[PDB]
Amino acid sequence: GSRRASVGSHEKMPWFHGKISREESEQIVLIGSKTNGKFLIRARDNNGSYALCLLHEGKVLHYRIDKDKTGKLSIPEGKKFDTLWQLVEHYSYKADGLLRVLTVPCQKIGTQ
Amino acid sequence: TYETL
Lengths: 112, 5
What we know:
The complex is a heterodimer.
Chain A: H1 23-31, E1 38-42, E2 50-54, E3 63-65, H2 84-91, E4 104-105
Parallel strand pairs in A: 1-4
Antiparallel strand pairs in A: 1-2, 2-3
Chain B: no helix or strand
């Protein structure tokens, strides 16, 4: 057993890079996103902090997302969820409050 | 840096 409360970010995924900085992911959005549906979720290892980042056409956004030190990842204006899997999938449905629903992952795919 | 959800 190690030291960790709940989930510890899931690498396996495009729009889920628990390494990117924040800009790095927003520059990626620079790449893609047109229909105002691209997004990406990121995590951090400092004090449990996640934030969704989607672009509203040439206007990349970010949304803070955390829990109540309970494990339930939520959002003030956004919503509430168990994990970034639900908050993402859910939001994968709608915006729920975002600028616009989600439709595409930000992160990259290949090289060239 | 967080829009308003």
